[PDB]
């Protein structure tokens, strides 16, 4: 199951709306929970959540000490849409002691902002250079290390410093040849169309996430005609795109431009009523 973007605040009630999601098509904001205690998060888990297409934001969630039980299999943050150029935001998470996103293999676009988390350790142990390309634009300041010593114990080492997420979880490292594709527990590369992980090697129907596009249970390089690229991660048909446009006619009224199903016509284009096709403006745009 693919779920839309979600903002969960005040109390954990609405969080169970994530129980069947394996992909969040949009962002995931979990914030402003002041009366939440660790007790509340004991048996709370979302093992199905594999991927976020936009960003993950966590702000002022009291009692949450780690993300290792909440999102144990979150493998990819696609970063299609970012929160001020960041795909991952951990801000003023007052009781967070570790990140623990031990399955996070790739942040496809955008940077990481981890700030003002006074109990947060296990950050120095994370080699982000294996998750992001744009590590230079990360902003990881004012955490427990900036004001104290973290007893970070862990395993792979890189320049030499050992890499881990928690006291009991190393950082997964695949052979250089495997690139971003992922690899099996035996070290065998996943198919060239996979991203982060897979259940079996050299099979694009055995991926956990796609390097490019998802179609019909497979990781494809491109959405072929008659399909359209949607949310920069999956292939959809004309009908799906049309039904989104009319569902919002009663939020965005979706259009067709350059083999994509997009929320709005680009600069200098207007929608030719009927076929959803973006046509260039004769003079100004209405």
């Amino acid at each position, epitope marked *: 199951e693919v779920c839309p973007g979600m903002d969960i605040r005040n109390n954990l009630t609405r969080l169970h709306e994530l129980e069947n999601c394996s992909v969040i098509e949009g962002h995931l904001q979990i914030l402003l929970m002041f009366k939440t205690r660790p007790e509340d998060f004991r048996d709370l888990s979302f093992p199905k959540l594999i991927m976020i297409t936009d960003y993950l934001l966590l702000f002022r969630v009291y009692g949450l000490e780690s993300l290792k039980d909440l999102f144990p299999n979150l493998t990819v943050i696609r970063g299609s849409r970012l929160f001020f150029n960041y795909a991952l935001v951990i801000f003023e998470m007052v009781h967070l002691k570790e990140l623990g996103l031990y399955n996070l293999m790739n942040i496809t676009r955008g940077s990481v902002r981890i700030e003002k988390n006074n109990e947060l350790c296990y950050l120095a142990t994370i080699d982000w250079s294996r998750i992001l390309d744009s590590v230079e634009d990360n902003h990881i300041v004012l955490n427990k290390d900036d004001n104290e010593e973290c007893g970070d114990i862990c395993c792979p080492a890189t320049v030499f410093v050992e890499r881990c997420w928690t006291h009991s979880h190393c950082q997964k490292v695949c052979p250089t040849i495997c690139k971003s594709h992922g690899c099996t527990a035996e070290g065998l590369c996943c198919h060239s169309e996979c991203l982060g992980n897979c259940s079996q090697p050299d099979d694009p*129907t055995k991926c956990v996430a796609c390097r490019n596009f998802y*179609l019909d*249970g497979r990781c494809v390089e*491109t959405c072929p*005609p*008659p*399909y359209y*690229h949607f949310q920069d991660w999956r292939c959809v048909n004309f009908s799906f795109c049309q039904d989104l446009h009319h569902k919002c006619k009663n939020c965005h009224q979706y259009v067709i431009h*350059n*083999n994509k199903c997009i929320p709005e016509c680009p600069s200098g284009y207007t929608m030719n009523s009927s076929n959803l096709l973006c046509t260039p403006c004769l003079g100004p745009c209405p």
Partner: antibody, heavy 119, light 115 residues
Framework: SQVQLKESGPGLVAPSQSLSITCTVS????????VNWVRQPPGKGLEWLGM???????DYNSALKSRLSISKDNSKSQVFLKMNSLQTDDTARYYC????????????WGQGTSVTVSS | GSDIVMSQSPSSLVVSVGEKVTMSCKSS????????????LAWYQQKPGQSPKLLIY???TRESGVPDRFTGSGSGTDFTLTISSVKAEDLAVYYC????????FGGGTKLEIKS
């Protein structure tokens, strides 16, 4: 594990009749891959008949559309061809081939099945 | 709209072992996809009494196993297949195929080898 496709056909068909071929596939899901029907008359070139997408949608050769019918049964790993009102020009070897659509063109082919339209 | 037409030239070629071979393919419409800037064009090789074998896809990408002597080139509507040093095993019919919208095979170029 081995990707393979096998056609079953009539051998011999009388003119004005219908032809029925079954492609039984193995080693990949029919839900994620397309299957084409390509025929080849003796001594002549390859002619594409039609395709059946993972989602069950079908595309046909516009010149033959009126007489063609492709369907499948994912559970039985079978794709079916039905071509009506056969004439002697329909005498050909009929192949089924996997379509890794979005990534590759027809990669794995069956050994084909010879169909002779005779009076 | 209307169905894509594929043309191949020459219809037949006779060459000696060790010579270069060039065969052409023409498309009624551009096969260049604006999304990835790749051409939806493939080359197949059919040896006598065997089913067709994929050589090249995306106009120039070699299929796994295909020798480096086989070289696909071209963009839009005009495409070629080149065999740098033709071997005796290269006796086959070579077909180009468009896979942009539906599929269309070209007439084929019969490659014959001189003794």
């Amino acid at each position: 594990s081995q990707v393979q496709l096998k056609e079953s056909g009539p051998g011999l068909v009388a003119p004005s009749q219908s032809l029925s071929i079954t492609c039984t596939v193995s080693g990949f899901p029919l839900t994620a891959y397309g299957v084409n029907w390509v025929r080849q008359p003796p001594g002549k070139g390859l002619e594409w008949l039609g395709m059946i997408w993972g989602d069950g949608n079908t595309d046909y050769n516009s010149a033959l559309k009126s007489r063609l019918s492709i369907s499948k049964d994912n559970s039985k790993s079978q794709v079916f061809l039905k071509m009506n009102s056969l004439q002697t020009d329909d005498t050909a070897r009929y192949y089924c081939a996997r379509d890794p659509y979005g990534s590759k063109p027809m990669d794995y082919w069956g050994q084909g099945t010879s169909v002779t339209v005779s009076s | 709209g209307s169905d894509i037409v594929m043309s191949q030239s020459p219809s037949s070629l006779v060459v000696s072992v060790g010579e270069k071979v060039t065969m052409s393919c023409k498309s009624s419409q551009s096969l260049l996809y604006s999304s990835n800037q790749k051409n939806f064009l493939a080359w197949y090789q059919q040896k006598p009494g065997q089913s067709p074998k994929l050589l090249i896809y995306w106009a120039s990408t070699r299929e796994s196993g295909v020798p480096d002597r086989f070289t696909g080139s071209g963009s839009g509507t005009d495409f070629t297949l080149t065999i740098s040093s033709v071997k005796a095993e290269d006796l086959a019919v070579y077909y180009c195929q468009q896979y942009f919208r539906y599929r269309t095979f070209g007439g084929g170029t019969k490659l014959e080898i001189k003794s």
